[PDB]
Nucleic acid binder design. Structure first.
Ligand code: MG
Ligand code: MG
Ligand code: MG
Ligand code: MG
Ligand code: MG
Ligand code: MG
Ligand code: MG
Ligand code: MG
Ligand code: MG
Ligand code: MG
Ligand code: MG
Ligand code: MG
Ligand code: MG
Ligand code: MG
Ligand code: MG
Ligand code: MG
Ligand code: MG
Ligand code: MG
Ligand code: MG
Ligand code: MG
Ligand code: MG
Ligand code: MG
Ligand code: MG
Ligand code: MG
Ligand code: MG
Ligand code: MG
Ligand code: MG
Lengths: 116, 86, 96, 137, 208, 23
RNA sequence: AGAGUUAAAUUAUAACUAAGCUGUAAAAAGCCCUAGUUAAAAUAAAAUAACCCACGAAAGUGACUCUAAUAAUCCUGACACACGAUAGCUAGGACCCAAACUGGGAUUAGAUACCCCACUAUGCCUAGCCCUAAACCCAAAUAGUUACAUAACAAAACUAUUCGCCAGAGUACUACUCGCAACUGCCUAAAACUCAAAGGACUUGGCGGUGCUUCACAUCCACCUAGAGGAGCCUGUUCUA
């Protein structure tokens, strides 16, 4: 549940030492934060390792082993396909909540009233 | 040390699945808060900084809980408007 | 609202209850004032911003022969009337 | 198919065997994954060191051994030496949070060791020794 | 640039249109291709419906072309093909019966095989980190690999030859060496692979 | 803001400490 | 405030294995009496519980057990009395770990800094001093009200009884006095002289080697082609004449 807020802030009516020192006022805004984009990372490292394992033992020749190189090519193709498709699927769907653009309008429909 | 070994923070793999067992253990540690504590204990933090971090985290948790509660409350009104054009 | 306390009869398990004696007392005066304004050839504008009964209010105003406003109320409508409506426009004599 | 992720403690009477040996006699693999290096030591149940391999022992360098590929290679290097002495199942005990944490665990399987369990024995003091000061003053 | 975005690339394959009834998946697309009023660009002069032309050969000729002497580039390509054909025929006639069943005289297949042999597998990308540039190993696209394979051979044959030796004569020897996996192009590919194997530990710097 | 006066007082105190150390 | 105890980690210490360990964006230095696993006293500190908000006048206090114990039949009130975080001093003891200073290694034009390594005072116990903090929740104590009423921001505006302070700014947490186990110390604390300002809050631009999203199509990179800077000449400049 929501953590208690009674007796936390520094106010004239509060007799004790304040517990929380908010950086900004605890006012519920009418817009949620934008979804952060995930930082990318290198891919197919484990397959490049086994591809170079062929070269290190076979004096850098591709006629010795072929399955590792083909698997690395398949991994590169799959990584490219995932980079292309996920870049448009993730910004569209989250599977757990509404898009931030719709959430902002929903919050503007029923905003908070810090005043009056 | 004095406790018995292979009891705490131990997960048994299922049918040779190691990647999933490692993810399960990582989730165990994250939910128990050990990952954050280990990352924090690499360098000592002064008590003033610890208090500031605790206050900031508490305020952030309160704000996030209230925002999630309001989102769940207002989720009903996401339906299509029946009085369009009036 | 803080100013609704004198106009409330009480609270029935959280829900406030409005007394009907004062409701009727105010409504008699309101209807008398509206009828006198209509009798004296006054422009009556039914204003309401609520997306449930907009069509009903528009039909009621059409039947009455008075004017209605149930859409987005523009900024300088009543104040900057000579620039929002026309060169010389007669403002409504009653707003409901 | 009732499977429990909890370890099979010796105090119980469950009948689980790997290659005919009980969970207590299965060898151990201590993987210390630091922020700059990853070391693996495969020992027997009697605490007898069987195999040892670190990222620096594979011809890497200062910043080269700190990556996950170095730990993945060290896993295979340790697994080869473990299999050379007749080891088929091992209990992985991880120590420390580093980039080559899961890399060594999967490198063991790549090198041919079947992991039955992953134990996270990371030293977390109960506010004991004071660590070093923070960086970026 | 004069063609608008609505213009679509033409299809030159005649067998694609000769038998549209052999499959139904292509029918659903080729029936709506023209229904949407899709305009088609003009067919380029380089590309035609001839069966003796290859896109790889056309790309190599375009890369070898200097300025706008397409006629000279085409003549050089034809002379290189003639030279490799005659050099293969000479060895075919000089060899015994057992080698005749193994030696190949078709220039197109040996050209394609040499290009594939000299195609690199992975490349290096310079990434700036900490104020210094690191050559991170990176998988390469098919077009990039083919372009590098062609460019290495072209650059080697343009500069590493004697003045009296002509471009078709040098290219004929280089194609055979690449096909047999002995050429300096293959040596350069091996050098690139060894550099990538040396810098493999820096592959974590890549973020894609 | 008030940091200007704080820094001015800090500089004065530092100079006074250096003078005391020298003399 | 005393007395007793230690779960995790670490270490002095032994055995097996192995060669590096540590170190950073990258390196170098350092240790190879090194590293991993198994056992391991002493010192230091006291993960989660804590999304708890209690105790104490404040400072401050949250590993466990025991003893003593948290004034006032409750207003304000000092220069009087008693306390008073960290740091520092004196004498004795302990010293895992961290670390002023220092000595090396990086970077830089310089780096007596930020980065890494080793180590000292010190942080740890007893007694005696020192009595300072952005000792700030920058909001005095005691009993109240939501009446009138938004300079601005911020923690909304105010009553009744008091105490302590405030008279432009710099000079100035200064000099000269008194007092103090303090002697490079603390409290109190001016003047000459210079200026017409010194300041608090806010608005709009601009900037940001702040951060988060969307971009660069000859544009930044990943990449392509053709050139300049090398030679002669033409031509235009800057220089001597
Ligand atoms: Mg209190
Ligand atoms: Mg603030
Ligand atoms: Mg500082
Ligand atoms: Mg000054
Ligand atoms: Mg004591
Ligand atoms: Mg212990
Ligand atoms: Mg000792
Ligand atoms: Mg060295
Ligand atoms: Mg504790
Ligand atoms: Mg009391
Ligand atoms: Mg009193
Ligand atoms: Mg002290
Ligand atoms: Mg010491
Ligand atoms: Mg140290
Ligand atoms: Mg130095
Ligand atoms: Mg003190
Ligand atoms: Mg304080
Ligand atoms: Mg004050
Ligand atoms: Mg007082
Ligand atoms: Mg205003
Ligand atoms: Mg003055
Ligand atoms: Mg002072
Ligand atoms: Mg003084
Ligand atoms: Mg350009
Ligand atoms: Mg030219
Ligand atoms: Mg030039
Ligand atoms: Mg020139």
């Amino acid at each position: 549940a929501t953590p208690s807020l009674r007796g936390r802030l520094a106010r004239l009516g509060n007799p004790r030492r304040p517990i929380l020192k908010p950086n900004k006022p605890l006012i519920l805004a009418n817009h949620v934060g934008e979804r952060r984009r995930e930082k990318g990372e290198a891919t197919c490292i484990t397959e490049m390792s086994v591809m170079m394992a062929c070269w290190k033992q076979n004096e850098f020749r591709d006629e010795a082993c072929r399955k590792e190189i083909q698997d690395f090519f398949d991994c590169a193709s799959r990584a490219e396909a995932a980079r292309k498709m996920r870049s448009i699927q993730e910004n569209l769907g989250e599977l757990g909540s509404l898009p931030p653009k719709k959430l902002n309008k929903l919050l503007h429909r029923f905003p908070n009233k810090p005043h009056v | 040390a004095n406790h018995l070994k292979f009891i705490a923070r131990t997960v048994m793999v299922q049918e040779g699945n190691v990647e999933g067992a490692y993810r399960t253990l990582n989730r165990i540690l994250t939910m128990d808060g050990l990952i954050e504590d280990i990352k924090r204990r690499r360098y000592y933090e002064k008590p003033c900084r610890r208090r500031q971090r605790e206050s900031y985290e508490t305020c952030r948790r309160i704000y996030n809980m209230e925002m999630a509660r309001k989102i769940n409350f207002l989720m009903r009104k996401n339906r299509a408007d029946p009085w369009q054009g009036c | 609202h803080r100013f609704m306390e004198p106009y409330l009869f009480g609270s029935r398990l959280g829900q406030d209850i409005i007394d009907l004696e004062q409701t009727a007392a105010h409504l008699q005066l309101a209807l008398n004032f509206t009828a006198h304004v209509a009798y004296r050839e006054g422009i009556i504008l039914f204003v309401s911003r609520h997306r449930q009964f907009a069509h009903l209010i528009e039909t009621t105003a059409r039947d009455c022969g008075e004017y209605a406003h149930t859409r987005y109320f523009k900024g300088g409508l009543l104040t900057n009337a000579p620039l929002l409506l026309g060169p010389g426009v007669r403002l409504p004599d009653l707003i409901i | 198919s009732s499977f429990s992720i909890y370890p099979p403690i010796p105090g119980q009477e469950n009948s689980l065997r790997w290659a005919g040996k009980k969970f207590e006699e299965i060898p151990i693999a201590h993987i210390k994954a630091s922020y700059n290096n990853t070391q693996i030591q495969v020992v027997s149940a009697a605490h007898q060191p069987l195999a040892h391999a670190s990222c620096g022992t594979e011809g890497f360098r200062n910043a080269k051994k700190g990556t996950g590929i170095a730990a993945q290679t060290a896993g295979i290097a340790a697994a080869a030496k473990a299999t050379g002495k007749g080891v088929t199942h091992v209990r992985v005990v991880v120590k420390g949070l580093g980039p080559g944490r899961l890399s060594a665990i999967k490198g063991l399987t790549m090198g041919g060791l079947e992991v039955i369990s992953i134990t996270d024995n990371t030293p977390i003091p109960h506010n004991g020794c004071r660590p070093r000061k923070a960086r970026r003053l | 640039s004069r063609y608008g975005p609505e213009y679509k690339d033409p299809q030159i394959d005649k067998e694609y249109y000769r038998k549209p009834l052999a499959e139904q998946t292509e029918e659903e697309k080729y029936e709506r291709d023209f229904k949407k009023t899709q305009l088609i660009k003009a067919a380029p002069a380089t590309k035609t419906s001839s069966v003796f032309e290859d896109p790889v050969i056309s790309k190599f000729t375009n890369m070898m072309m200097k300025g706008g002497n397409k006629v000279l580039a085409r003549s050089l390509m034809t002379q290189t093909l003639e030279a490799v054909k005659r050099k293969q025929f000479a060895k075919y006639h000089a060899a015994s019966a057992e080698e005749q069943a193994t030696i190949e005289r078709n220039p197109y297949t040996i050209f394609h095989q040499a290009l594939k042999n000299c195609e690199p597998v992975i490349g290096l990308v310079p990434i700036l980190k900490g104020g210094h540039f690191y050559q991170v190993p990176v998988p390469l696209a098919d077009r990039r690999r083919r372009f590098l394979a062609m460019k290495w051979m072209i650059a080697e044959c343009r500069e590493k030859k004697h003045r009296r030796v002509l471009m078709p004569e040098k290219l004929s020897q280089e194609l055979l060496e690449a096909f047999h996996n002995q050429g300096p192009v293959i040596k350069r590919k091996h050098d690139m692979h060894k550099m990538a194997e040396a810098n493999r530990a820096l592959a974590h710097y890549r973020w894609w | 803001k008030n940091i200007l006066k704080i820094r001015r007082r800090k500089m004065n105190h530092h100079k006074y400490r250096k003078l005391v150390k020298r003399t």
